């Protein structure tokens, strides 16, 4: 009628927010290598050989690495996978059933382990959006946005303080933590260069370590403190994986205290750092609260090749605000590493519709 | 224009940009068990959406006048202000949810007028 009647659109890039469970996308190497957990291989959905991505132009889209909801499913898939998977001989679950310490005893075979890349695909609809800017502080906007059907080549590693074999930061490092300089939050930084660590004890390089400390110290100064000196301190203290660092070294987990690495004083105004590691047989379980026990290694001196990419560590927290800044190693939460892999995305879905209130008046 | 390639104040060019996109709405032991079930579920969901699309009272695109009166409580649009430009998100989900409420009402009313006239006309 002479009044406004609205139109019906179709095939629109409009969207509606979605809250759901995505699925793993890792090739079914299930049949040939082995199904002994090598990092997604029990029954995981294969990867689309053609990853789709459409860049979004002039879309000032913001992203928070704390409210993803894509993150929510990854740790559930990983815990379920480690359970079906590489098994310790000792399982401990203290529960009040003050509490009753429960125990589950099974076999613990050891195999050569290596993380495999896991893409994350969505069901029909559920558009995923990839932030591709340079200055991304975790809880920040993104000028360069590009939607995707499935995630990129994410190579996650369940690990301690420094993320192993993962993604990279933007041009030096990127301070992506919740708070930048609060003495109450965990610092969430990822590397930009794959720091090769050779473990036989680990022959940690010194020039690359001094360079990563220099790039991070300059970024911390750019984030906080114009004329300030930032010095590094030794370990914070705690469990084995807290003082030392757990990482995939040919399946095993050597434990070198990273206290002989963080003692560099940088100024605003060299063959191998062979740290003492430990043979891993009994450690606290990282899945839940308890302990584990595994099979002895097949090698006395264990060789492995690993590239470490990430920087999550603790801090003193004194004031000591801009006079000097002091940071200590540690951290590497399972909940936070879980958030740290999938940090630039969100899921939205849509049906082909949208309006314009007009006086077009067509029959039906 | 593009798949999210513009940024402006709201209401009309989105009808126009979606008009252009809709004018060119086509863009033109071994091998396999898990992927096929996902394709089947996707086509079942798409076709279920299409039959529900088929039971509607508009059947037209980007310019449609289905029978519910977007009443004066909802109508504030000036005549020439209806078709100018439109991007805007939190505002959009509320706009989009408003789009759907008119949609269900509209198609229910045209289904009601089509059915009402169907019972009453009787068009020899």
């Amino acid at each position, epitope marked *: 009628a002479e009044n406004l009647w609205v139109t019906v659109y179709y095939g629109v890039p409009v969207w509606k927010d979605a809250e759901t469970t995505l699925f793993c996308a890792s090739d079914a190497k299930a049949y040939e290598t082995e199904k002994h957990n090598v990092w997604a291989t029990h029954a995981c959905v294969p990867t689309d050989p053609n990853p789709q991505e459409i860049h979004l132009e002039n879309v000032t889209e913001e992203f928070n690495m704390w409210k993803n909801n894509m993150v929510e499913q990854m740790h559930t898939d990983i815990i379920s996978l480690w359970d079906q998977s590489l098994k310790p001989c000792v399982k401990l679950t203290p529960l009040c059933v003050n509490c009753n310490t429960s125990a589950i005893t099974q076999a613990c075979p050891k195999v050569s382990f290596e993380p495999i890349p896991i893409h994350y695909c969505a069901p029909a609809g559920f558009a995923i959006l990839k932030c591709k800017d340079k200055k991304f502080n975790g809880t920040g906007p993104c000028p360069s946005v590009s939607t995707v059907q499935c995630t990129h080549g994410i190579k996650p590693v369940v690990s301690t303080q420094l993320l192993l074999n993962g993604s990279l930061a933007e041009e030096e490092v990127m301070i992506r933590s919740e708070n930048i*300089t609060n003495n109450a939050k965990n610092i969430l930084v990822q590397f930009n260069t794959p720091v090769q660590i050779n473990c036989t004890h680990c022959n940690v390089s010194k020039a690359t370590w001094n360079e990563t400390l220099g790039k991070v110290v300059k970024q911390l100064r750019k984030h906080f403190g114009n004329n300030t000196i930032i010095r590094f301190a030794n370990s914070s203290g705690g469990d084995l994986e807290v003082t030392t660092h757990s990482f995939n070294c040919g399946g095993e987990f050597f434990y070198c205290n990273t206290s002989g690495l963080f003692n560099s004083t940088w100024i605003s105004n060299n063959d191998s750092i062979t740290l003492p590691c430990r043979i891993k047989q009994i450690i606290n379980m990282w899945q839940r609260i308890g302990q584990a026990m595994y099979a002895p290694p097949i090698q006395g001196v264990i060789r492995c090749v690993s590239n470490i990419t990430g920087l999550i560590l603790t801090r003193d927290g004194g004031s000591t605000n801009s006079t000097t800044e002091t940071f200590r190693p540690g951290g590497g939460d399972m909940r936070d590493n879980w958030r740290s892999e999938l940090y630039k995305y969100k899921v939205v879905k849509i049906e082909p519709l949208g309006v314009a209130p007009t006086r077009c008046k067509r029959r039906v | 224009l593009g798949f999210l390639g513009a940024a402006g104040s709201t209401m009309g060019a989105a009808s126009m940009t979606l008009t252009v996109q809709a004018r060119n709405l086509l863009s033109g032991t071994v091998w396999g068990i898990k992927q096929l079930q996902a394709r089947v579920l996707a086509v079942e969901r798409y076709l279920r959406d299409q039959q529900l699309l088929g039971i509607w009272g508009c059947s037209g695109k980007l310019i449609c006048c289905t029978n519910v009166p977007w009443n004066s409580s909802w109508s504030n649009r000036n005549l020439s202000e209806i078709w100018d430009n439109m991007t805007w998100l939190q505002w959009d989900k509320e706009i989009s949810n*408003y789009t759907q409420i008119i949609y269900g009402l509209l198609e229910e009313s045209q289904n009601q007028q089509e059915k009402n006239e169907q019972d009453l006309l009787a068009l020899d």
Partner: antibody, heavy 131, light 107 residues
Framework: QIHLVQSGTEVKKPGSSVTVSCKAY?????????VNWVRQAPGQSLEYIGQ??????????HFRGRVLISAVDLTGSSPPISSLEIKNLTSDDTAVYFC??????????????????????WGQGTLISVS | DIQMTQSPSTLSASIGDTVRISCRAS???????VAWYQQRPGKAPRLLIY???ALLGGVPSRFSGSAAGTDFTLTIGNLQAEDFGTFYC?????????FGQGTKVEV
């Protein structure tokens, strides 16, 4: 669990500039929390001056060229401090200033329209008698 | 702009009543992009119901509304002692946003 604090009491000369603050406890950054500045005639209604969305210094056409907004972003040791610059403080500029911190990351529940967002929380209110 | 005019200015009521508070506006707003700011005596204005009638889990369900074209009658049922205040229907739709006239609820 989130409280907003503005500047204190300020009395400026006729034909001067002002610099009031907006501290935001429990707030991360202006990138996620854009602040819309609104003035208030003493005792009367509140007139929206402008905004600093995505670190954008702007104001309304009634306030353009006289009001620009800077919001010094700090987190952790110091809450996000949203400042306000109003030049040429005449006696008619006697007003009660106001800021508003609301999230910009949440983008599908009901908080904002073309910059003018839902004003969830407010500060104390700064009565400034330009004399 | 769009001059909001909250109707009435003053009204008398007891505790446990249902009174509709109109809000004039030259433009209607689809879905009521007008936030009611209850400025209670001794407290700053606050958010009562985002989106006119949407469900907010921080404010009790005693606050409800209705929209009639140019007017927006917030039908607040079960009035209480804290309900005796000056509400403020503020459109956060147009640029800039404007307040209404204000409605005082008294004995």
């Amino acid at each position: 669990q989130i409280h907003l604090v503005q500047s204190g009491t300020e009395v400026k000369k006729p034909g001067s500039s002002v610099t009031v603050s907006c501290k935001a406890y429990g707030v991360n950054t202006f990138g996620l929390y854009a602040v819309n500045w609104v003035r208030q005639a003493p005792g009367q209604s509140l007139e929206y001056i402008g905004q600093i969305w995505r670190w954008k210094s702007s104001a309304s056409h009634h306030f353009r060229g006289r009001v620009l907004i800077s919001a010094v972003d700090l987190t952790g040791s110091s809450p996000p401090i949203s400042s306000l610059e109003i030049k040429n403080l005449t006696s008619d500029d006697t007003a009660v200033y106001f800021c508003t911190t609301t999230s910009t990351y949440d983008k599908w529940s009901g908080l904002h329209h073309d910059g003018v967002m839902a004003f969830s929380s407010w500060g104390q209110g700064t009565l400034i008698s330009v004399s | 702009d769009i001059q909001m005019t909250q109707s009435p200015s003053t009204l008398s009521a007891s505790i446990g009543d249902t009174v509709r508070i109109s809000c004039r506006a030259s433009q209607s707003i689809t879905g009521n992009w007008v936030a009611w700011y209850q400025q209670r005596p001794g407290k700053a204005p606050r958010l009562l119901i985002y989106r006119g009638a949407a469900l907010l889990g921080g404010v009790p369900s005693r606050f409800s509304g209705s929209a009639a074209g140019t007017d927006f009658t917030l039908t607040i049922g079960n009035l209480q002692a804290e309900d005796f205040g000056t509400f403020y229907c503020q459109q956060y739709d147009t640029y800039p946003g404007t307040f209404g006239q204000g409605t005082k609820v008294e004995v």
